[PDB]
Design a protein around this ligand. Structure first.
Ligand code: COA
Ligand code: CAC
Ligand code: MN
Ligand code: MN
Ligand code: MN
Lengths: 217, 75
């Protein structure tokens, strides 16, 4: 389609995105305490991304509901639902799905610029740094890698309730618009299964990177 | 952990590009500190204090007061 999230997730997962903060949005009463002490920039992205999430939820037949935050900041979806949210300068986006079709989903949006000084060494394995150098010119592969690593954590955490560091996954980026993440730590999930690899997709458009991972059921 | 906390507050201001004083018990995400900014803050505190810190630093101690007690403890 024309929307970034829709281009990297199957249609069975409804999504919604806004590139600005429209005037007059407000949080639900239950959500107000979470941003009552927050700066305007933070308030705005929080409110707009949740308008997006509630739009995607309505497609699945779920009515207006607060989306609060858990112990590590994870969004708290209605039972039977998985989802992911992301905000950056010029993007607010959300995607959701039912657990009957997908186990987990994460998305992340970043501006298509080089990473700040020092960040790449903080987040990349030495092998990843050489792999990025072999990729074709014309794409900020360092920012794509950082984006994909965050999407890996966003997909990983609802399944494990465990931390996942940047050195704990090896992400391989294909110019294809796909990527793979190989988990280097113990990947025991909370259903008994073992999480070793994730399949990801990525797109660059409107000056943004968007990466997505769907963990199939 | 007092002298060090205000220096942490100064590095946060540099990362956020701000000049107002910060509440030490205010979670950093309410100031708009996102994941990339926490990486930058983590790297700046290593170079500024000359010590090693984990990159899950800010997410372990999400306030200035928590960060200062962590940083003073092992430093
Ligand atoms: C979760 C994280 C990646 C997002 O940071 P960010 O800069 O705000 O990036 P985004 O704007 O795209 O995503 C924000 C959304 O992610 C969701 N989020 C926060 N914590 C989450 C968690 N454990 N799990 C899933 N989603 C989470 C929230 O919906 C949040 O939005 P909200 O606060 O308005 O409700 C970062 O905060 C983090 O904790 N990273 C852990 C370390 C890591 O990334 N390791 C990589 C593994 S290889
Ligand atoms: C009050 As202050 C200088 O620690 O932000
Ligand atoms: Mn954000
Ligand atoms: Mn991101
Ligand atoms: Mn880490």
């Amino acid at each position: 389609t024309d929307q970034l999230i829709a281009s990297v997730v199957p249609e069975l997962l409804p999504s919604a995105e806004l590139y600005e903060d429209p005037p007059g949005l407000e949080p639900l009463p239950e959500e107000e305490p979470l941003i009552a002490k927050s700066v305007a920039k933070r308030r705005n992205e929080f409110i707009t991304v949740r308008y997006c999430a509630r739009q995607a939820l309505s497609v699945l037949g779920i009515p207006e509901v607060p989306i609060l935050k858990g112990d590590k900041g994870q969004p708290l979806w209605p039972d039977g639902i998985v989802g992911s949210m992301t905000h950056t300068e010029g993007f607010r986006g959300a995607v959701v799905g039912r657990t009957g079709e997908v186990r987990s989903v994460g998305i992340d949006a970043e501006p298509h610029d080089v990473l700040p000084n020092g960040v790449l060494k903080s987040i990349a394995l030495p092998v990843e740094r050489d792999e990025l150098d072999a990729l074709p010119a014309g794409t900020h592969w360092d920012r794509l890698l950082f984006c994909a690593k965050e999407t890996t954590y966003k997909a990983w955490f609802p399944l494990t309730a465990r931390w996942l560091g940047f050195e704990d996954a090896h992400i391989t980026i294909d110019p294809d618009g796909t990527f793979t993440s190989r988990i280097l730590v113990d990947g025991r999930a909370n259903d008994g299964t073992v999480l070793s690899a994730f399949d990801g997709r990525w797109i660059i458009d409107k000056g943004l990177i968007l990466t997505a991972i769907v963990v199939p059921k | 952990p007092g002298h060090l906390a205000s220096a942490i507050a100064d590095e946060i201001r540099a990362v956020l590009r701000s000049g107002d004083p910060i509440d030490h018990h205010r979670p950093l995400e309410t100031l708009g500190l996102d994941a990339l900014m926490g990486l930058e803050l983590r790297n700046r505190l290593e170079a500024s204090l000359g010590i090693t810190l984990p990159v899950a630093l800010v997410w372990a101690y999400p306030t200035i007061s928590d960060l200062a007690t962590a940083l003073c403890e092992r430093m």
